[PDB]
Each structure stands twice: as structure tokens, then as C-alpha cells.
Chain A
Amino acid sequence: QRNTMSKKELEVLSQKLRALMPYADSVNITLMDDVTAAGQAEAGLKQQALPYSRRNHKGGVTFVIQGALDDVEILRARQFVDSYYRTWGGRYVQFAIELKDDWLKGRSFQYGAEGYIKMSPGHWYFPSPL
């Protein structure tokens, strides 16, 4: 999708790569589908039962895996990620893995459009829409 090149241009590109790699006899250019890439990523996370969120941009997809994770989850995650990366590279899909504690450190709050935090009984904080 993202490349609009003519066959002649592709041939020229091929020849220049061949000039950069003096040990290679020829370079074969193959066109792949982005939807396929993104799909295999998301299906792999579901196949591993990991919790995640997905975000889409003009030119990339970010899967954010964050929170309190078990040792088993961390192991499975790092194994899968290392496998996928070796196949597609880090140029289109990114994985962000972050350990988080409790979101608000264990204190009561209202999460509406007018949410707020109870610092202590008798103490309101109103920092931001939660």
C-alpha cells in the first residue's frame, strides 16, 4: 500500500542493492500486505491470552501491554515478541511492555467525567478527569 513505484524504479532499486552487496548475485523484491502483518501480531497476543490495547496510526500499529503481570505472562510475552520481531522487524508494529503498580496507589476515587481522588477521608483532590 505505502509504496507507489513503477517496475522500472523497482528494477533500478534492485540494481543499486546488488551494487551494495558484492557477494550477492541478485536481489528479489517481494510485496507484502500490512493487514496481514497487523493481523498476525494481534492473533499472536490473543493466542497467548495477554492483556493489551491496540492503537492505529497513519503508518504504524502500537500494542501496549501494561499493568501487574505474572511471571508466566512476562515469560510468554518476551518469547512471542522475540519470535515475531525476527520475522517482520520493528519498522511497522511496536510492542510496549511496562510493569505498573495500582493505578492510583490504593486509594478511593470517582472515575466519572467529574472524577476526583480521596487523599484521605475529608480530603478531595480534583486533579483531572479520571
Chain B
Amino acid sequence: EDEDVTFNDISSLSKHVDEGLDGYRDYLIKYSDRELVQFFENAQLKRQYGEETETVKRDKDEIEKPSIFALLPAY
């Protein structure tokens, strides 16, 4: 709702919308199991970029804002 001027153009709008969802990504991430989140992320990378892409093994991790379609079934 916030009425203050905030966006001007396509990149600023897409960033404004994306930024508005972090309040809920933080929730899903706080209760999802790290191992499952990692599995569903790697298995998407191997769909898009090809299975030869390096298997990440982010064993010590800051999971880089994972996609919500990957994050939701892990929760």
C-alpha cells in the first residue's frame, strides 16, 4: 500500500516486487531443512544449465536467495 514514490521503470519495478517478498522467503528458509533446500536447488541447476555443471556441495552455506518453487516443497 505504501504511498511514497518508489519506482520509475521496469528494472526498478521488478526489484520492488522482488524485494517485497523477502519477508516471506525469510520464513520459509528459517524452518526448511538445509539438506532438502540444497537438494531441490541442485536438481534445478542440473535441469537448466546441464548435469555437467559442478555439483555445488554448499556444505557451509549462505544459500543465495533460492527460488521459491525450489524452496516450497522443502518446507
Q: A: which residues have CB within 8 A of B?
A: 120-123
Contacts and interface: CB of A to CB of B under 8 A. Distances in A.
B60 to A, nearest CB: 15
Contacts of B52: 121
- Interface size of B as a range: under 10
Contacts of A120: 54
Nearest to B52: A121
Nearest to A120: B54
Query: Looking at chain B's contact residues, is the secondary structure mostly helix, strand, loop, or mixed?
Result: loop
Nearest to A122: B54
A108 to B, nearest CB: 14
A121 B54 CA distance: 6
A101 to B, nearest CB: 26
B64 to A, nearest CB: 16
Nearest to B57: A120
Contacts of A123: 54
Contacts of B54: 120-123
Nearest to B54: A122
B57 to A, nearest CB: 10
A118 to B, nearest CB: 11
A117 to B, nearest CB: 16
A122 B54 CA distance: 7
| Closest 5 pairs (CB-CB, A-B) | A122-B54, A121-B54, A120-B54, A121-B52, A123-B54
5 contacts: A120-B54, A121-B52, A121-B54, A122-B54, A123-B54
Nearest to A123: B54
